[PDB]
Amino acid sequence: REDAELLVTVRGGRLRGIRLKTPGGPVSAFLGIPFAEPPMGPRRFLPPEPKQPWSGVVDATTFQSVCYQYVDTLYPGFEGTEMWNPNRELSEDCLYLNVWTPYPRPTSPTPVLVWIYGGGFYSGASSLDVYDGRFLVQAERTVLVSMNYRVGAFGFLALPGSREAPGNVGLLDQRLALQWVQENVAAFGGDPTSVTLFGESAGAASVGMHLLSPPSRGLFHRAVLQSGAPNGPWATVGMGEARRRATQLAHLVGCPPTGGNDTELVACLRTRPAQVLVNHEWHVLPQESVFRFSFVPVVDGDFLSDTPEALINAGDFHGLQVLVGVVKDEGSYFLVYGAPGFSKDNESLISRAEFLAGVRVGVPQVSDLAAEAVVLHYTDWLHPEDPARLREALSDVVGDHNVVCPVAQLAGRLAAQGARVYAYVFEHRASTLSWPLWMGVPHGYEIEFIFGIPLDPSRNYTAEEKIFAQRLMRYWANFARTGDPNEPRDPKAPQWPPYTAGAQQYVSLDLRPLEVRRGLRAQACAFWNRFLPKLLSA
Amino acid sequence: EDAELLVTVRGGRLRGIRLKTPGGPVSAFLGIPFAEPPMGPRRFLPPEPKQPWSGVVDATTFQSVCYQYVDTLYPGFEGTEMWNPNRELSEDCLYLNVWTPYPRPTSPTPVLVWIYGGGFYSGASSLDVYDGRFLVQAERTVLVSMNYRVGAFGFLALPGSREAPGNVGLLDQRLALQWVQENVAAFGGDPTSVTLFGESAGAASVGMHLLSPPSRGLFHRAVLQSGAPNGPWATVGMGEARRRATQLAHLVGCPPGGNDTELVACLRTRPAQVLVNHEWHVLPQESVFRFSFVPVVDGDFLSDTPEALINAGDFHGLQVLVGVVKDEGSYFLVYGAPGFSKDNESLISRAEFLAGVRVGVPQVSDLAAEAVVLHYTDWLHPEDPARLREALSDVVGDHNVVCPVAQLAGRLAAQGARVYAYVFEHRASTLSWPLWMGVPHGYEIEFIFGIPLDPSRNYTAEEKIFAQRLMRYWANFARTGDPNEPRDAPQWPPYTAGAQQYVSLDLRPLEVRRGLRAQACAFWNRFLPKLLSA
Ligand SMILES: *[C@@H]1O[C@H](CO)[C@@H](O)[C@H](O)[C@H]1NC(C)=O
Ligand SMILES: *[P@@](C)(=O)O[C@H]1CCCC1(C)C
Ligand SMILES: C[P@@H](=O)O[C@H]1CCCC1(C)C
């Protein structure tokens, strides 16, 4: 008949879940819960509408479809890229979320972790194997929630001002899911008064944008930003550049029969097959680049009343705890996607000329003067032409500019203006990593340890990596529970101190115990965060 | 009667003097007139050759010091007084000095020609620290040094005017170099082997003779100590030179109008001391390491900026010796940087550091200043007083000396010259400046001249041996274009734009290092010009 633990009533109606085996014991999963009406046809580009209630029992027993998105084909069959590609069918009918909870259901309200995946706002899915929430829930006995949100043009094409494609609807998808958590998580044993958002890359930037948008800020209590920030040069776009990209995309697919009435242009875009839009998505970028994505949140005064830097600088953050961090080699992954001389399949020992050309690819759309300032800071003038050093320096350019320095600026401003901040650098290169050795610890490869994937018996992680994963999961849930990653009552472990704008302390996460260090690439980030903006104004 | 001390030059006959050194005697001829006195109507004009005289010129004592400002910041302090005039001031100052071995050489001897520094506003060949007797005895060279006009008298310029054309102090030096060509053989010197050496504004002067074709035939090698003609202080454009000349006229009660002739005529009626009293006030702002009347780029002595001439030059066949002291900037900080004094530790605050950056890098945009602060801040310790003191010393020294010298060395090397570079890292046991100043600007000179060998001074035995080493390097270079002694040393390798090798000079054996502040000088030499022009 029925298992009462696998049956739950939410405001929309009744749900049936599944019981998941894990190495440490059973977990209840409710996968594929509809939280919005499907944004098909006339609802493409529009804000999400809440799911209408249903009679009977919805089977929330497997992940639903991946939101329509480009699929990477740079290295076909390569494990390092395929792990990020969709593992369900692509559909515009994709607005579903997932809830994992302990089995049996918690007796008293349990803190909630809400995951927001990355993928540059053009890709990603909550169903990816590396986001499997069963291990976190089993190890640390929280409730975990993840949602799908529209990406690409479907989530972020913006004709600012228009009613028909206002932009930012993917962020509205995320907000609706968070509202769902407030109204419904108690039914699963979750505590709506203790919700911790966490996300990586574009998911981290999304987390930050919810920090900076007052209507979202009521829906959670803490935040974890892994390898991303809302103030990154890739994470937002201005109203005019968003309109330009939307209009060129419409133009490239025949709309209209180049601007005109916004209503007629969007109506024509709605008649195009989803895959047709995806096929032209990368062609609207203003130049060849890496770490730039066509359709991203737009600063239009609505979701974001100002740029994220301005909101960060002007914000009062007392009563907030954040945990932020980066991996050791943020920049390496992206270089093989356009930097001249780079391949995962050789050592990418570039020339000086290839370094100079790469600077313009990795810092697109800046003046020649600005590019020269980059070359000045990242050249070692005792060894200006050494290939190994140039390869490392271009990786630093791309990673500092897009991840480390935006994270460091956010960390410093939030700490100075009232928040308790904890910062990390993730320094372990997984035994199973398929990218070449020169890429180091690439962007995105801490996620599997945070989610406890090494505990999966069918995988081949070493034993101390399982210990490491257990330690990280324990750092993440303590912060979720207490706003403090340190273990409630001890002076045994070397202790993780808060990050402040003065001492700038952070810890290294790897197989050895915590080591405290100073400065999130402070000399470099002073260039990106303090000087370079003065140069672009003048 | 001592025939060794009697010489006939083209203008007439001279009587010299025998001097003692710890190694034996030398012959000195001091106060030889090489130009007509540039007095009255000749103020501001190019020098005229000295007309012949009858009788015997008394050349046994130094002549007058050219009119100049006298430092009064620390009255009676040895560290400033050793640079102040030690003879009476006069516009009748164009004399030069020759030291030769005793008895005079009877075989052509290589010649060293010393051009003193002093910001183009001060200096004298008669200063104790330039005493040429020890080099000549120990290394058996002929040594010549001249007085040249400084301040407004040597470099006031109304460009285009015939009454104050500018650069006449540089022409005083050229005239003395022509005098050497015509007369040095009468002393035993070889006019075909003349090495110019100078320090600070003297080194900038050496460099300008390198880049001016009428001077290039007057010497064969060059030594540039802590200075370069491409310094931001060593030259001035025509427009700013004219502005400074006209503000001096106004400050001393002269016209305009307007008309250059009437302006200069009125300036010529003013006592020399009056011009000196207003010299500092024609500068456009509060500053350190800036001087009012310096060489002017007007297309004549210099047909282009020294930067341009250095980049466009064919320097095959040139040998140069260049170098810097370990702490070029420290001395200058006590003359205007907020919070600095020789009498305390000068542990400044961030606010003083930021104000000091506009004093030490004057007349640049706010954006340029911000880039300086970016590069010279340690952003892990942005507020640490000791690090701020050191950093502002580095700003002043890099901008004014180290990076102009590094640029000269790299361009000359890459365009055919053989370059030797050094950093002088010995703090004199006798130094009277505070310890935080390190090895300041100018404090290698006394070692090059072998002053430590003077038994009435307090130098250590190891310091005397060190002076003897340096005198040997300098004279080896004058003789052969190569400072190295026969392999024992380690060897002193040439400086190249790629390897950037130089040696450290101190009590320990030579140690070869790479890069003359390469990271800081990429900022000053490569990036900052792009920023200022865009
Ligand atoms: C074109 O846009 C206007 C509003 O801008 C709208 O009212 C009108 O209905 C649109 N055209 C058609 C044919 O509907
Ligand atoms: P300048 C750059 O000419 O240096 C002088 C300042 C006063 C004493 C000197 C000769 C070292
Ligand atoms: C910066 P984010 O969008 O980076 C994405 C790209 C694929 C893997 C990933 C790290 C989740």
Q: Give me the residue spans of the domains in chain A.
A: 1-538
Residue B115 carries which side chain, given as an amino acid letter? I
Ligand closest to Cα of A235 equals 3
Please indicate if any CB of chain A lies within 8 Å of the CB of B367. Answer: yes
Paired tokens of A37: 């009406």
**3-class SS shares of chain A: helix, strand, coil, % to 5:** 35, 15, 45
Paired tokens of A330: 């943020």
- Which element (helix H / strand E) includes B296? strand B296-297
- Residue B419: beta bridge partners? B320, B495
Name residue, tokens 């072998």.
B450
Inter-chain residue contact A538 with B500, CB threshold 8 Å? no
Paired tokens of B334: 């006590």
Q: Which residues line ligand 3 (CB under 6 A)?
A: A 84, 118-120, 200-202, 228, 443-444
Q: Cis bond leading into A297, ω under 30°?
A: no
In angstroms, what CA-CA distances link A154 with A281, B24, B408? 11, 95, 59
Round to whole Å and give the CA distance between B399 and B232. Answer: 8
A250 Cβ contact list (under 8 Å, min separation 6): A256, A258, A265, A268, A269
Round to whole Å and give the CA distance between A76 and A85. Answer: 11
User: Under the phi-then-psi rule, with left for phi > 0, alpha for psi from -120 to 50, and beta for the rest, what region is B166?
Assistant: left
Paired tokens of A100: 């994992």
Round to whole Å and give the CA distance between A409 and A310. Answer: 12
DSSP 8-state symbol, A35: -
Inter-chain residue contact B534 with A369, CB threshold 8 Å? yes
What's the CA dihedral at A396, A397, A398, A401 to 10 degrees? 110
Q: Cis bond leading into B490, ω under 30°?
A: yes
Round to whole Å and give the CA distance between A10 and A181. Answer: 10
User: Resolution in A for the shown PDB structure?
Assistant: 2.3
Nearest CA in chain A to B368: A535
User: Is A330 designated active site?
Assistant: yes
B396 Cβ contact list (under 8 Å, min separation 6): B288, B289, B328, B329, B332, B333, B337, B360
How crowded is residue B193: how many other Cβ atoms within 10 Å of its Cβ? 19
Round to whole Å and give the CA distance between A184 and A178. Answer: 10
Please indicate if any CB of chain A lies within 8 Å of the CB of B287. Answer: no
Please answer whether residues A232 and A201 qualify as being in contact, where contact means their C-beta atoms are separated by less than 8 angstroms: no
Name residue, tokens 């730039």.
A292
DSSP H helices, B299-444, are 306-311, 330-333, 350-360, 366-376, 385-397, 403-414
Please answer whether residues A298 and A168 qualify as being in contact, where contact means their C-beta atoms are separated by less than 8 angstroms: yes
- Which element (helix H / strand E) includes A8? strand A7-10
Between strands A321-327 and A420-426, the pairing is parallel
Binding-site residues from annotation of B for galanthamine: 83, 199-200, 331
What are the phi and psi torsion angles at A57 (to 5°)?
A: -115, 120
Q: Which of A383, A386, A404 minimizes the C-alpha distance to A329?
A: A404
Nearest CA in chain B to A527: B374
Round to whole Å and give the CA distance between B351 and B349. Answer: 5
Between strands A190-200 and A222-226, the pairing is parallel
Round to whole Å and give the CA distance between A474 and A253. Answer: 49
Q: Which of B231, B404, B412 minimizes the C-alpha distance to B321?
A: B412
Round to whole Å and give the CA distance between A113 and A199. Answer: 10
Residue B365: list chain A partners with CB under 8 A.
Answer: 538
Between strands B95-101 and A57-59, the pairing is unpaired
Name residue, tokens 């090798």.
B501
Please answer whether residues B158 and B233 qualify as being in contact, where contact means their C-beta atoms are separated by less than 8 angstroms: no
Between strands B142-146 and B95-101, the pairing is antiparallel
A375-378 long-range contacts (CB < 8 A, ≥24 apart) are: A376/B522, A376/B523, A376/B526, A376/B527, A377/A524, A377/A527
Q: Crossing angle, helix B366-376 and helix B350-360, to 10 degrees?
A: 120
DSSP 8-state symbol, B427: P
User: Can you point out the beta strands (E) in B163-247?
Assistant: 189-199, 221-225, 236-237
Paired tokens of B66: 């050219």
Paired tokens of B434: 């505070």
- Which element (helix H / strand E) includes A81? helix A79-82
Paired tokens of A533: 């903006």
Q: Which of B461, B482, B463 minimizes the C-alpha distance to B473?
A: B482
In angstroms, what CA-CA distances link B13 with B4, B18, B53, B186, B483? 13, 17, 8, 11, 36
Paired tokens of B462: 């190891």
Terminal-to-terminal C-alpha distance of chain B: 70
- Residue A518: beta bridge partners? A505
Please indicate if any CB of chain A lies within 8 Å of the CB of B365. Answer: yes
In angstroms, what CA-CA distances link B137 with A165, B20, B107? 91, 10, 16
Residue A381 carries which side chain, given as an amino acid letter? W
What are the phi and psi torsion angles at A489 (to 5°)?
A: -130, 70
Q: Which of B189, B115, B243, B138 minimizes the C-alpha distance to B464?
A: B138
In angstroms, what CA-CA distances link A235 with A298, A324, A371? 9, 17, 21
Round to whole Å and give the CA distance between B398 and B391. Answer: 10
Q: Which of B122, B125, B145, B200 is catalytic?
A: B200
Round to whole Å and give the CA distance between B94 and B38. Answer: 8
Q: Is the CB of A5 under 6 A from ligand 1?
A: no
How crowded is residue B369: how many other Cβ atoms within 10 Å of its Cβ? 15
DSSP 8-state symbol, A320: -
User: Under the phi-then-psi rule, with left for phi > 0, alpha for psi from -120 to 50, and beta for the rest, what region is A147?
Assistant: beta
Q: Which of A164, A309, A330, A354 is catalytic?
A: A330
Please indicate if any CB of chain A lies within 8 Å of the CB of B200. Answer: no
Paired tokens of A446: 């801490």
User: Can you point out the beta strands (E) in A149-286?
Assistant: 190-200, 222-226, 237-238
- Which element (helix H / strand E) includes B273? helix B272-277
Q: Which of B354, B447, B342 minimizes the C-alpha distance to B392?
A: B354
| A344: helix, strand or coil | coil
Please answer whether residues B136 and B143 qualify as being in contact, where contact means their C-beta atoms are separated by less than 8 angstroms: yes
B207 Cβ contact list (under 8 Å, min separation 6): B222, B224, B227, B228, B229, B230, B234, B306, B408
Residue A500: list chain B partners with CB under 8 A.
Answer: none
Round to whole Å and give the CA distance between B206 and B174. Answer: 10
Paired tokens of B519: 């990271």
In angstroms, what CA-CA distances link A313 with A323, A337, A414, A522, B478? 18, 33, 8, 18, 63
Q: Is the CB of B393 under 6 A from ligand 2?
A: no
- Residue B296: beta bridge partners? B236
B259 Cβ contact list (under 8 Å, min separation 6): none
What order of strands is seen across the sheet that includes strand A57-59? A7-10, A13-16, A57-59
- Please give the number of the atom of ligand 2 that sits closest to the Cα of B201: 3
Round to whole Å and give the CA distance between A247 and B414. Answer: 53
Round to whole Å and give the CA distance between A290 and A329. Answer: 15
Name residue, tokens 């100043």.
B437
Mutate to test the interface with B, among A376, A404, A531 (most CBs of B within 10 A): A376
Round to whole Å and give the CA distance between A171 and A116. Answer: 10
A527 Cβ contact list (under 8 Å, min separation 6): A373, A377, B374
Residue B451 carries which side chain, given as an amino acid letter? I
User: Is B375 designated active site?
Assistant: no
Paired tokens of A160: 């600012």
Q: Which of B55, B47, B51 minimizes the C-alpha distance to B8?
A: B55
B119 Cβ contact list (under 8 Å, min separation 6): B200, B201, B233, B291, B294
Round to whole Å and give the CA distance between B277 and B378. Answer: 41
Exposure b/e, B56-83, CB count within 10 A at least 16 = b: ebebbebbbbbbbbebeebeeeebbebb
Paired tokens of B464: 């005397």
Round to whole Å and give the CA distance between B90 and B97. Answer: 17
Inter-chain residue contact A369 with B519, CB threshold 8 Å? no
User: Is A443 designated active site?
Assistant: yes
Q: Ligand 3: distance of its center to the CA of B241 in Å?
A: 60
Residue A93 carries which side chain, given as an amino acid letter? D
What are the phi and psi torsion angles at A420 (to 5°)?
A: -85, 120
Round to whole Å and give the CA distance between A502 and A484. Answer: 20
Please answer whether residues A243 and A158 qualify as being in contact, where contact means their C-beta atoms are separated by less than 8 angstroms: yes
DSSP, residue by residue, A418-453: T-EEEEEEE----TT--S-GGG-SBTTTTHHHHTTG
Of A376, A522, A523, the CB nearest to B526: A376
Paired tokens of A496: 């993780």
Round to whole Å and give the CA distance between A503 and A507. Answer: 13
- Which element (helix H / strand E) includes B502? strand B501-505
Breaks (C–N over 2.5 Å) after residues, chain A: 257
Round to whole Å and give the CA distance between A178 and A169. Answer: 14
Please answer whether residues A63 and A126 qualify as being in contact, where contact means their C-beta atoms are separated by less than 8 angstroms: yes
From atom 1 of ligand 3, which residue's Cα is the shortest distance away?
Answer: A201
User: Can you point out the beta strands (E) in A294-352?
Assistant: 298-299, 321-327
Name residue, tokens 């972790």.
A113
Round to whole Å and give the CA distance between B150 and B161. Answer: 19
Of A373, A379, A526, the CB nearest to B379: A526
What are the phi and psi torsion angles at A10 (to 5°)?
A: -105, 175
Q: Which of B177, B171, B185 minimizes the C-alpha distance to B42?
A: B171
Please answer whether residues A351 and A449 qualify as being in contact, where contact means their C-beta atoms are separated by less than 8 angstroms: no
Q: Ligand 1: distance of its center to the CA of A263 in Å?
A: 6
How was this model experimentally determined?
A: X-ray
Q: Cis bond leading into B38, ω under 30°?
A: no
